[PDB]
Amino acid sequence: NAMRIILLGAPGAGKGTQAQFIMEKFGIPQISTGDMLRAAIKAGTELGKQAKAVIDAGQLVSDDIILGLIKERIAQADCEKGFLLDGFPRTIPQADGLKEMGINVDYVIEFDVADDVIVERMAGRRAHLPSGRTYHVVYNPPKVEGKDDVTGEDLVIREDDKEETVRARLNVYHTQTAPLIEYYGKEAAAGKTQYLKFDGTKQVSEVSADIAKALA
Amino acid sequence: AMRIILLGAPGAGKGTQAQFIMEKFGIPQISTGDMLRAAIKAGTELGKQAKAVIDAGQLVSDDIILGLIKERIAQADCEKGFLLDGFPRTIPQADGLKEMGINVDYVIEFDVADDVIVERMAGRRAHLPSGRTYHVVYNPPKVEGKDDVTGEDLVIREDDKEETVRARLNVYHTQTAPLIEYYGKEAAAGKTQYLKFDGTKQVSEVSADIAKALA
């Protein structure tokens, strides 16, 4: 058989831990829309070119450009058993595009972790600006609070990590995602796809469990 | 066949000529980070291996990076050559390559004075939540200090201010200096062609000379 999944979840919710689990468990690669495209431009593929031409000129990348990569990405040999789409489609026409290019998804999984949780998580992040080395006050502390483990120089909390900024970020995702939730929730209700929501504050081992249970 | 190493300060926009060369000469730009991030997401045996290091809070080791590049450059698109951007960063990494028989035809040192980089950086403006990136001299918003889309405020990223930039740059050269002598020594022997270009100059003008050189 084959296995294709779309994956949604909030910026900072840390969904990648389960992408990489799905990866291992089902053996299907990760395709970041942003990485796949970054790769192409730097590799100078036909599509990396075309994109890179649009970019240079400061213009908006056509969707026809994007589905092609994905048509080429899933045309990679590593996708034989399927794949995982991370935070894509981002729009209804992208939902439609996938379909109209022969990509019809088995499961749509949504990793939700309350906004409020995520902000406190971002808030723990520190960094050292001259070297860009990062820290988190819980998940991986410096050996000393406030100080860079390599230069002994003080740490900062990035601005983009702060509530104001993360909160702004969060509202856009929600604002953008809701119709896809709505779109595929509509697909799923009509058995077109299976839509699944997981509590991402349960321990990884736990979430990983339920996830496997569903995908039987 | 022509193999190439790009050396250049962060933000001096070496990436800019790295794309010229690829366009002009048809060889891919190879970024270790990117190459590394992609193996992880593809979950290659090595990508898998490397991912484990990260979750352990450790650095990825040379053998793994070297094994990824080995993997990269054996790919179809590299038959006529490739551009290494962001590697090697150590002498052992440098020796690592040579062992594997990496036949660098040119080492290219992209140079912009510190003070020029500072002023370059001094012009970047960010809209924090999207990470979109304006620039007052090279790429301004529709509206001054305002985000075209949202109409939000653009900030002067703390990351782009002088104390840090020169801090960063300072570190940059201490690290890089030994590669320069390393490749200076190699060139001395003849094992590669060492080149150097002033990046303070305009791009199409810089790209021009590069092409002449690699003719």
Swiss-Prot record, chain A:
Catalyses: AMP + ATP = 2 ADP
**Region of interest called LID, as start-end residue ranges on this chain:** 124-161
Entry's Gene Ontology molecular function annotations? adenylate kinase activity; ATP binding; nucleoside diphosphate kinase activity
- Pfam family membership, one: ADK
Q: How does it assemble?
A: Monomer.
Job description of the protein? Catalyzes the reversible transfer of the terminal phosphate group between ATP and AMP. Plays an important role in cellular energy homeostasis and in adenine nucleotide metabolism.
Family stated for the protein in its record: Belongs to the adenylate kinase family.
Listed name of the protein: Adenylate kinase
Q: Which organism is it from?
A: Vibrio cholerae serotype O1 (strain ATCC 39315 / El Tor Inaba N16961)
